[model samples]
Structures are given as C-alpha cells and as structure tokens.
Target: KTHVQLSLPVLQVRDVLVRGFGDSVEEVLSEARQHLKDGTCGLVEVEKGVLPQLEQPYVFIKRSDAAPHGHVMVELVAELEGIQYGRSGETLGVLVPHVGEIPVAYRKVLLRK
Candidate 1:
C-alpha cells in the first residue's frame, strides 16, 4: 500500500513569526512525511486542524493530499508568549515529519513550557 501525492506541495508556508523546532526542523519534517505516506501514523481528533481559541492557539494540520492517511502538515497560528495572556494572534508554522502526528495537548496554559 503506497500512496504518494504531491498536488498540495506537501506543505505551504504563508509566513513564519517564530521558527524554533529542535536542531534540524526540516529534517524532522521530512522524516515524518515518510511515516505518513507509509501509513505508519494516524492523526487523532486533537492532532487535526483547529481554530485559535484562548491560550490553546490554532492549528491547521492537514495531510499532504487528503485528510485520511496523508502526509502531516501543521500550521500553528498563535503566539508562543500568548500562553501567559491567554491570546491567539501569532503565526507559527512547522513541518512535522516524524511519528505521524505532533503531540497537541493544551493543559494549564501557564504551566506549559
């Protein structure tokens, strides 16, 4: 079972306010794409696209091609420091390419690092 589609360009970067993802962010993303294409990962309800709300931020994480069993693409919309003021209006984009879905959990905004 091999499904590879590059119509959506795998990822699109409209703009980036903050780009901080470990040492090699691109490498991480590339690797994750492989996982998604191979169906080695699955997106959960929380890992999918979402609207900006409170300190929770916003994410439009869609697969490369389709929604089900496609390469993972993430567009985080919110400010990193917003966790303190409980706001959402920053643009943060990242290409998560590993393990399938990026861990998205909003528990105690002030307590997140």
Candidate 2:
C-alpha cells in the first residue's frame, strides 16, 4: 500500500477556496482578502493565536492505497488562525493562530477549491 501527501501554508477558507455561486476562485479569494483588510472578516480557532489578516488558505490533499476498502474523507487536521468571510457574503468560520504540524491528503480539486 502507498500514500501521497502534500503540505501548504495555512490560510482563510475564503482566501484558499470557496467561490461564490457565479464567482471564480480568483475573484473570491481577492475579495475575501479585501474584506479581511477592511475589517469585515470572521474568526476560527487554530493552534492558539489570533490571526487578524487571512493571507491565504492552504491544505494537504492526500491519496492512499493501503486500505482494503476504497474509502475517502476530508479531515481538518489544522485550521489557520485569522478572520475569514465567504465571497457570497457568508460567514465561513473563525481561526485560531498557532504553529504545529498536521497530516492530510492532496487532491487536484484543492486548486479549484
């Protein structure tokens, strides 16, 4: 059995993925950043700090071949600390700031998310 893993910097959901109904990933992240800088963002719990600015959202998409049964899942190993807001004018979640290592999988959809 084998597994694939990747790591990326932590960021806000809005800054990473989560585009509006008719919006593109770029547009959503751009606008989300603007909101963070403009003081219109929410918060999420991470390690143990307060991230005022959500530079970007990152994640690790993983794929493994060790399981006897074919199964997949999305796990929140680590959450970036910062204020985040959806491009669709919705509240995603708050972030807790801190530093630590976590495990996750990698996927192409991550780019689109």
Candidate 3:
C-alpha cells in the first residue's frame, strides 16, 4: 500500500487554573498559626473574597483537614451562583514541602509566597 499527505498549518491549545490571593493570604497565615498550634498540617480550603476595581474578588476562610504528618497543602475555592459546590472548577495544589513536622520558619515562608 502507498500513501500521500499534504502539509497544513498546525493549531495548538493550552489552558491553566488561576486565581488571586485576595483575602486568602491572611487566611493562610491564620491556618499556618493553627497548624503550628496543633502540631499538624493538612489540605486547606481558602474561600475567595471581593477584589478591588481593576482587580478581582474571590476566595474565603482557609481550613486544614489534618494530614498524617505535618504537611501543609493549600487550595482555593470560589462561590457559585447562589450556591457553593465542591470540585466545581477547582485548582489542585501541591503540598507544602516539610519534614516530619512543620516549623514556624517554614510556615512564614509558605505564606510569604
């Protein structure tokens, strides 16, 4: 069998998940404090808040669902049209690298970012 082909312009597509720190920044600090207090870390869900003009409004309270070890994981959440749902357009985040425990130094660095 023989085959013939013609060259054509190629089209590429890509996408990414993005959001503003908003009030999540402060919430993150609070969560970090709690993490230190409990000697634990976990997956945190920080809700969104309103952003100023020329900006954006999103994200809320940051919470941690304790992990086996002290590994802090952070994620952001936005409100829906009158209702909030889980995993409804979500951004999966990487765990804040740490050893067996999270230290105040590491916590400050995590939030400073």
Candidate 4:
C-alpha cells in the first residue's frame, strides 16, 4: 500500500552546534520557523520537519504538471551557519535522488493523518 508523506529529513554533519534532526535546534540559529531550538549547545542532525503535504494534504509536490512523491519533492536542508559553529547549509539539500526521471512518489509513515 502506498501512503502520502515525506521522510523526516536526516541531517548529517559534525560537531554539536550545527543543524540536525530534532523538534528543536541548537541555540546558535536564533530563528526557527515552526519549532525553534530551545537554546542548546549541541546538534541532532535533522530537525524532524512536518510534512508539507500532510499539513496541507490534498496537495502533492508538483513537478511541472505531475505530482511527484513527497520524498522526491522534499529537499533536506542545512540551515544558515548561524553562529559560525555549524556545517554548510549547501549539504542540506544533498541527498540520493530517485533514479530515472520518476519521483519516489511517496514517503509512508507509522500513522498518517
């Protein structure tokens, strides 16, 4: 069965001050969109971002005309260096792409809304 969702971006990096996966981030970034870092001094890689499609379900990632899978459209990110104590934001969007010209189509979940 296919589900509609994007994987929780896994931020790969070093040190304990850069960006990563978590409900919060290191106190370095200073500005968080949804859930800001609760003022810490470490990193967890990915920030555990909510699904863009799920928040606004009924909408899939669009590629020209077709709705690519959330995983395909979902681009992991590397937030600003913040306090000059983290990894490069460029590596954020760097991930293994879906082979061929087709998108992954979907990223399932334990319990999708």
Q: Write the per-residue lDDT of candidate 3 for residues 2-61, one digit (tens) a residue.
A: 211111111111111222323444554444334433534322222242122111223322
Q: For residues 48-93, what per-residue lDDT tens digits would candidate 1 score against the true structure?
A: 3422321122222332221333323232222233332123332223
Better of 1 and 2 by lDDT: 2
Model 1 segments more than 4 A misplaced:
1-23, 47-60, 63-113
Model 3 ranges off by over 4 Å: 1-55, 80-113
**Candidate-wise lDDT, in order:** 0.28, 0.29, 0.27, 0.24
Q: Please name the candidate that would achieve the greatest lDDT relative to the true structure.
A: 2
Better of 2 and 3 by lDDT: 2
| Residues 1-113 of candidate 4: C-alpha lDDT, one tens digit per residue | 23233443232323112222332233212222122113111112223442221111111111121124333322122222232233222222222212122232323221112
Clashes of each: 3, 16, 9, 9
Local accuracy of candidate 2 as per-residue lDDT tens digits, 1-113: 13222123334433433312113334444544444334332233233333333334422122221222233322221123333332221212332222232313212111112
Relative to the true structure, candidate 4 has a C-alpha RMSD (angstroms) of 16.3
Model 1 lDDT-worst window of ten: 104-113
Clash tally for model 2: 16
lDDT measured at residue 49 in model 4 versus the true structure, 0 to 100 = 47
RMSD to truth, every model: 13.9, 12.9, 19.6, 16.3
Q: After TM-score superposition, what is the CA distance of residue 3 in candidate 1 from its true location, in Å?
A: 8.3
RMSD of 3: 19.6
Ranking by lDDT: 2, 1, 3, 4
lDDT of 3 at 25: 41
